[PDB]
Design an enzyme around this catalytic site. Structure first.
Site, short mmCIF file in Angstrom:
data_model
loop_
_atom_site.label_atom_id
_atom_site.label_comp_id
_atom_site.label_asym_id
_atom_site.label_seq_id
_atom_site.Cartn_x
_atom_site.Cartn_y
_atom_site.Cartn_z
N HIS A 100 -9.70 7.89 4.07
CA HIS A 100 -9.58 6.51 4.49
C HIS A 100 -10.97 5.89 4.70
CE1 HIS A 100 -5.46 7.79 5.31
NE2 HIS A 100 -5.07 6.53 5.04
N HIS A 113 1.52 4.27 -2.99
CA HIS A 113 1.28 5.71 -2.93
C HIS A 113 2.37 6.41 -3.79
CE1 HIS A 113 -1.97 6.39 -0.22
NE2 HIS A 113 -1.41 5.82 0.85
N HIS A 160 0.86 -1.20 0.00
CA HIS A 160 0.00 0.00 0.00
C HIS A 160 0.91 1.26 0.00
CE1 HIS A 160 -3.60 2.35 1.79
NE2 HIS A 160 -2.56 3.14 2.15
N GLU A 161 1.96 1.18 0.82
CA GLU A 161 2.87 2.34 0.90
C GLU A 161 3.57 2.61 -0.44
OE1 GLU A 161 1.90 4.03 3.33
OE2 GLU A 161 1.23 2.35 4.52
N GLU A 184 -6.28 6.48 -1.88
CA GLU A 184 -6.23 5.39 -0.82
C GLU A 184 -6.72 4.01 -1.35
OE1 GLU A 184 -5.17 4.67 2.21
OE2 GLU A 184 -4.15 6.56 1.85
N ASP A 194 -9.98 13.34 8.47
CA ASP A 194 -9.23 12.47 7.54
C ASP A 194 -9.25 13.04 6.18
OD1 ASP A 194 -8.03 10.04 6.61
OD2 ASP A 194 -9.91 8.97 6.49
N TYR A 208 -4.38 14.49 -2.05
CA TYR A 208 -4.77 13.80 -0.83
C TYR A 208 -5.96 14.38 -0.09
CZ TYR A 208 -3.71 9.70 2.22
OH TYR A 208 -3.77 8.54 2.91
C1 LIG Z 1 -7.37 8.61 9.65
C2 LIG Z 1 -6.11 8.26 9.14
C3 LIG Z 1 -5.13 9.23 8.84
C4 LIG Z 1 -3.83 8.92 8.28
C5 LIG Z 1 -3.48 7.60 8.15
C6 LIG Z 1 -4.42 6.59 8.42
C7 LIG Z 1 -5.67 6.99 8.90
C8 LIG Z 1 -4.48 5.01 8.34
C9 LIG Z 1 -4.24 4.64 9.84
C10 LIG Z 1 -4.12 3.12 9.93
C11 LIG Z 1 -5.44 2.57 9.57
C12 LIG Z 1 -3.78 2.73 11.34
N1 LIG Z 1 -3.26 4.53 7.50
C13 LIG Z 1 -3.38 3.67 6.49
O1 LIG Z 1 -4.45 3.18 6.12
C14 LIG Z 1 -2.06 3.30 5.82
C15 LIG Z 1 -1.49 2.17 6.71
C16 LIG Z 1 -2.38 0.91 6.73
C17 LIG Z 1 -2.35 0.27 5.35
C18 LIG Z 1 -1.83 -0.05 7.80
N2 LIG Z 1 -1.09 4.38 5.95
P1 LIG Z 1 -1.08 5.67 4.81
O2 LIG Z 1 -2.48 5.76 4.25
O3 LIG Z 1 -0.05 5.34 3.80
C19 LIG Z 1 -0.62 7.09 5.74
C20 LIG Z 1 -1.76 7.74 6.50
O4 LIG Z 1 -2.42 7.04 7.54
ZN LIG Z 2 -2.61 5.15 2.36
#
Ligand SMILES: Cc1ccc2c(c1)[C@H](CC(C)C)NC(=O)[C@H](CC(C)C)NP(=O)([O-])CCO2
Ligand SMILES: [Zn+2]
Ligand SMILES: [Ca+2]
Ligand SMILES: [Ca+2]
Ligand SMILES: [Ca+2]
Ligand SMILES: [Ca+2]
EC number: 3.4.24.27
Length: 316
Positions: A231, A146, A142-143, A166, A226, A157
Site C-alpha cells: 500500500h 482486485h 478498487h475492491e 494495489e 504491509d 500480494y
Molecule cells: C496496511 C494496510 C493493510 C491492508 C489493507 C490496507 C492497508 C488499506 C487500509 C485502508 C487504507 C484503511 N486498504 C485499502 O487501501 C483498500 C481500501 C481503501 C481503498 C479504502 N482495501 P484493500 O487493499 O482492498 C484490502 C487491504 O487493506
Molecule cells: Zn487494495
C-alpha cells in the site's frame, strides 16, 4: 432468489437519492438481474461470518440509515460492472459474467473494505476515521478491480507485484469515479475518510508524498510491513499513471499528458495481456510500453509519454 425484476429507490451514505435494481418475491431483495449473472448485496449484521443474508426489504424503499451502505454497495457495483463492459468489453470480473456479491455492515467499527477471494466486504467505519466504506465509488471500484486482477494477471500480494496490484485498483477505481462523473479527482477515498476534516484522503495519485508515500523509485520502502509495502509503494506507480494521463514535470522529467481514456486502454491491455503473477515494476514498464505500441504504434506520442512517465518515477 427467483422473482420479478423491479426498481426501488433509496438514499446512500452521503444522503443522495438513487434508484437501485431489486427483485421482488414476497420481499424486495437487493438482487440486480440486469447485469450479467446478477449483483447481490448481503447484510453481515455486524458479524464476521460471510456472506450473511441476502438483503430483504418490505417495501422497496431504502431510506433507513441502516440501509445506506447497502444501497451504495449495490449501486456502485452496478456502475463499476458497467464501466468494464462499456469501456473494456469485459463481462464482470472473470470475463464470463460471474455474479458479483458484496456484504455490508461487516463487523463493528471496521475501518476497511476488501475482496476475500470470492466477494467484496465493507466495514461501517468507526464513524471518526471513516464512514461506511461503500459510500466511496473509488473504494467499491478498487475492491472489484482486485477481483479483475486475480482473474487475469494474478499479481501476487507482496513486494513489487503486490504494489502493482494495489496501484491497479487505485487507478481503475479512479477511472470509474471519472466515468461516473461523481466529483472526480485523483485522490483515493476522499468521500468516506475523516468526515470531520475536509480536503483530505487516504492516498493521493497526483502527489503521493502528501501523505508520505513514495513518488520516486529511489524512495521505495524495503521493509516487511504491509506485505512489503504494497500500500506504500503503489504510490510510485500511481504517480506514473497520473503523469501519463495529465502530464507534468516531475523530478525534472517532463511528460506530455495523453488523457484518461488512453491511460485506461493501455493499463487494461497490460493487465490482461502481459502481466504475470510475479511481474515487477520494471516488467510493468515493458508491459505498458508494449501495450501502447500495440495500440498506437511505436513512434507514437503515446509510447513516448509512457516512457517519460516511468523515467520520471525512476523505473527503468
Ligand atoms: C496496511 C494496510 C493493510 C491492508 C489493507 C490496507 C492497508 C488499506 C487500509 C485502508 C487504507 C484503511 N486498504 C485499502 O487501501 C483498500 C481500501 C481503501 C481503498 C479504502 N482495501 P484493500 O487493499 O482492498 C484490502 C487491504 O487493506
Ligand atoms: Zn487494495
Ligand atoms: Ca424499506
Ligand atoms: Ca471524488
Ligand atoms: Ca477519489
Ligand atoms: Ca475527510
Amino acid at each position: 432468489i427467483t422473482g420479478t425484476s423491479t426498481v426501488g429507490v433509496g438514499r446512500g451514505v452521503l444522503g443522495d437519492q438513487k434508484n437501485i435494481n431489486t427483485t421482488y418475491s414476497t420481499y424486495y431483495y437487493l438482487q440486480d438481474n440486469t447485469r450479467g449473472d446478477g449483483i447481490f448485496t448481503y447484510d453481515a449484521k455486524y458479524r464476521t461470518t460471510l456472506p450473511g443474508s441476502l438483503w430483504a426489504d418490505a417495501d422497496n424503499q431504502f431510506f433507513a440509515s441502516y440501509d445506506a451502505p447497502a444501497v451504495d454497495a449495490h449501486y456502485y457495483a452496478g456502475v463499476t460492472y458497467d464501466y468494464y463492459k462499456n469501456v473494456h468489453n469485459r463481462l464482470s470480473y472473470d470475463g464470463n459474467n460471474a455474479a458479483i456479491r458484496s456484504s455490508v455492515h461487516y463487523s463493528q467499527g471496521y475501518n476497511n473494505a476488501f475482496w476475500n477471494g470470492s466477494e467484496m466486504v465493507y466495514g461501517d467505519g468507526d464513524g471518526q476515521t471513516f464512514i461506511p466504506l461503500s459510500g466511496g465509488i473509488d473504494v467499491v471500484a478498487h475492491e472489484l478491480t482486485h477481483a479483475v486482477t486475480d482473474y487475469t494477471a494474478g499479481l501476487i500480494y507482496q513486494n513489487e507485484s503486490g504494489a502493482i496490484n494495489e496501484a491497479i485498483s487505485d487507478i481503475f477505481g479512479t477511472l470509474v469515479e471519472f466515468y461516473a462523473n461523481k466529483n472526480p479527482d485523483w485522490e483515493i477515498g476522499e468521500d468516506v475518510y475523516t468526515p470531520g476534516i475536509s480536503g483530505d484522503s487516504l492516498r493521493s495519485m497526483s502527489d503521493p508524498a502528501k501523505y508520505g508515500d513514495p513518488d520516486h523509485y529511489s524512495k521505495r520502502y524495503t521493509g516487511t510491513q504491509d506485505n512489503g509495502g504494497v500500500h506504500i509503494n503503489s504510490g510510485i506507480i500511481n504517480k506514473a499513471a497520473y503523469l501519463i494521463s495529465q502530464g507534468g514535470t516531475h523530478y525534472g522529467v517532463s511528460v506530455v499528458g495523453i488523457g484518461r481514456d488512453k491511460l485506461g486502454k493501455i493499463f487494461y491491455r497490460a493487465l490482461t495481456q502481459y502481466l504475470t503473477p510475479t511481474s515487477n515494476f520494471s516488467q510493468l514498464r515493458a508491459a505498458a510500453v508494449q501495450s501502447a505500441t500495440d495500440l498506437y504504434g511505436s513512434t507514437s506520442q503515446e509510447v513516448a509519454s509512457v516512457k517519460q512517465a516511468f523515467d520520471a518515477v525512476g523505473v527503468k
